[PDB]
Symmetry: none
Subunit: 188 residues, 7 copies
């Protein structure tokens, strides 16, 4: 149905629940109520794969409500970095267009490596690739160059809602992000 | 069935409930037990579309009870501004007249822009536009000039009750206000 | 059935319940356990329509129990003024006579305006107007001359019980006093 | 079936319950565990109608248990004065004899006025009048001369238990004492 | 069935329960875990009727457990004096012998008056009188010479248990001791 | 089903439950998690009958878990002294051998008197006497010389569990220890 | 049904539960969120039998989540020492390879005795001995040379989860480790 705008406040899981999905302690979280982009990427086709909850994707006249949260192991530690973003739109078409602003504008990014200049002044190099995608689903993976750290991301279009879930950690975040995305979707 | 005068105290939702409807934190609220107008508008036709719970609309010898509340993000923040007003009338006709005091007096306001002078001293310019309206429902949307901020409002005439729900925020407050209006209406069965 | 004397203590609703009936905050109440008249009226026919719980009406050798309470918005605020009085009589006849001390002695008060001299020294002017009255019910409404303030009053004779309910406010207290009178009656 | 001695401690109702029966506040009570007489009457036939819980009535070799309580509006207020007395006897005959010590010894007290000299030194004049009396029930009313104050009393013989209930107040205590006597009898 | 040794701790009722049985306030109690005799009697046949929980009766190689408690109105007040004693024996025969140390040794005590010299130095005269006695029950009543104060006692042999209940008061403790003995027996 | 190692922590009853089995106050206890011997005996055949929870009996490479507790009236009172020991073994045979380390090594001890030198420096003389013993049960009773004090003990082999229960008191601890043993066994 | 990564946080039992399994007081515990090896062994074939939750066994690009905890009688007492390690893998194969990294690399450790040099500086000598092992189970027992102290260990492969449970004490920890391994396995029925 037209998921009521109130779902965004429940669809973003707390640090406690995030911890019991990734299977590790998560002591620090920061809730963001407005879409932000705290970077710029050299290869501009990868922009909408770098991070989730981006103005470019979510900012729209028909955006009813938006809520997200960045979760970490501690304030100082990034062993696990999880991010969630949920936007409710007035119409299904408004959400469908926001979903396609991710899939259409990230053609060519798959299999490329580019630099990402953060607002704090730092620079990082990430290798983007893969991502099994249907009409309503778009996944992808970004690997930090010169480490075994990988971020698995899922973007789900469910009627008038656009879910985005990101899980960063060594090994394989694939199973974790899929559970997190599904856990968020259940609140709708 | 007509609602009893008591429903007004339950029909106005708290800041917690309002927060869960809009989908954002709402820390500040202020309950008003008497209809009030804290502004004057340049184009006077738009008067009864500028705000809700107005004495012009609700003050009547057949007003049995009235209750409302303004809710905000914080005391110093208006990212979300929600307002509610519920009035119970002695008769269905008394309420129907109070409803028509909104629809009749706001003809021509649709599609216009006007400045609004607030009691605190500030001035804001809002572009109005009429929404869907049946015999027992009147919805309109007002947009602040220069910004992406919009207030969606719903006025509902339910037997001997007149509901009013306003939700102000960037993007589309259309779904949010409809949930709030419906949530207020459900308590009339109590 | 005949009501037991004990109902008077339950039949007079507290400020919390009175508030929920009128639909406004009621912070101040004062219980009175004895019929009392703290005024005299110029047109003496209006006496028993000025106020409720009057010695003239209730005081009788067959008065078993009596209770009442005046309720206000605050101690210093009269936006809403509610008053209740309940009296249980030894016989149905004794109560029926007490009821007829309200209807018979208030002939010629309907449609009149008279001054009311309060014990505290103040004087007020109220215009009286008789309402619907059956054999077991007597409703009247009094309006303070030069204001939109009106008091709707209901007097109900239920077997051996005499209920009196008053609700004073701007607008229309007609619905509110009917809910109050009914709520007081349900306790019997 | 014949009540156990333990009932006396439950058959005497507290000030809270007594207040709810008379329909007025009762803030002061005083439990007495032994029958006493704190007076003497001029016309000696009226002795056992003056008060309840009297040694003359209850004192018996077959008295199993006894309990009573005087209840008032407050310590300094006698608007309502309620008294209860319950005695359990070893045999039904012991209780029946104790019942007949009230009915037989108060012949020629009905319709008389007499003075009652209290232990504290005071004197009061009361006018007695017999009420409805079966084989197991004896009711009577005493009225204080020169006031509207009347005391309705009920003595009930139930199996091996003798109940006594007194309610003193202006107006009619008749309904109130019958409720009290009935409420006391239920606990058996 | 033969009771377990543990019943003694539940079979002795607290002052609260004893108060509800006699139907009067009981504020003071003292639990004794060992049989004692704090007196000697002139006519020595009456020894085992003077008191309960006596070493002469209960002290046996086959005594598994024992518990008792003396209860009073207060530390200073003896209006009601109640005493309980419960002994569990290894075999039914041991308990039966203990019961017969009460019935056999108290032949010729019935209808006699004798002095009783207490440990504290005081002396008291009591008139004894045997009550109904089957094979498993032995009831007797003792009266303090001069006063209307009587103690009704019951001794009950229930399998491998020996109960003793005493209730002292003016009037008739007969009903009260039977309820107590019955209440103690139910805990088995 | 062969009892899990965990049972030992629940099979040992606390001072509250021990008090309700012996039917007397038990204020002091001390839990021991390791088999100990805090004495030596002159006639060394009686070693495994002197006390329970002995290293000689329980210590074994197939001992899975062990728990026990000594309970007394108070820290300075031994009117009642209760002791419990529970050992779970890896196999039924390991427990069966540990059971026979009691029955085999105590031949000739029955009907003998011997002195027991305690670790605290005291000496006590006890007379031993064997009781009923099947293939899975071994009961004995030791009597402190020159007193009526006796300790009834029960060793029970239940599958892969070896229970030991001791109750010390004047009179007969026989019924008390059989209840305690059974109470410990039910937790398996 | 491949167990979700989250199970690791519930599959590692607390000191209270562990105390009820071994049947003795367990006052001290320390949770470890990452596989770690705080020792080196002289005979290197015994490496993956010395301890549990070892990087060599668990560390893999398909390791989804890992959690474990060491439990003791007290901070200063080791009468009972219990260790648990649970790792969830992205596939059943990734977990099956991690299981075989224990069974394949500990051939010729059975019946041997070797010294073990701990990071804190201490040394301990342990006599190892292989136990019953199926395709999805690998049990072994190690005994501290010169004491009656023995550690029974179970390694269980359950779909995409690798369980490891160690119970150390005098007498026989065989029953206790089977209860603990079983208790940890029951929590894998949780979504």
């Amino acid at each position: 149905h037209p998921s009521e705008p109130g779902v965004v406040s429940y669809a973003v899981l707390g640090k406690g629940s995030v911890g019991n999905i990734v299977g590790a302690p998560m002591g620090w979280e920061a809730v963001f109520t407005r879409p932000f982009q705290a970077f710029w990427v050299e290869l501009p086709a990868c922009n909408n794969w770098v991070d989730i909850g981006l103005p470019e994707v979510y900012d729209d006249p028909d955006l009813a409500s938006f809520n997200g949260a960045t979760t970490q192991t501690s304030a100082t530690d990034q062993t696990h970095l999880v991010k969630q973003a949920v936007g409710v739109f007035a119409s299904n078409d408004a959400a469908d267009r926001a979903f396609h602003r991710v899939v259409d504008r990230t053609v060519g990014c798959s299999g490329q490596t580019t630099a990402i200049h953060l607002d704090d002044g730092t620079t990082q190099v990430w290798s983007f690739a893969g991502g099994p995608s249907t009409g309503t689903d778009e996944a992808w993976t970004k690997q930090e160059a010169g480490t075994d750290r990988r971020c698995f991301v899922q973007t789900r279009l469910r009627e008038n809602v656009l879910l985005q879930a990101k899980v960063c950690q060594s090994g394989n975040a694939g199973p974790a992000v899929n559970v997190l995305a599904g856990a968020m979707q259940n609140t709708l």
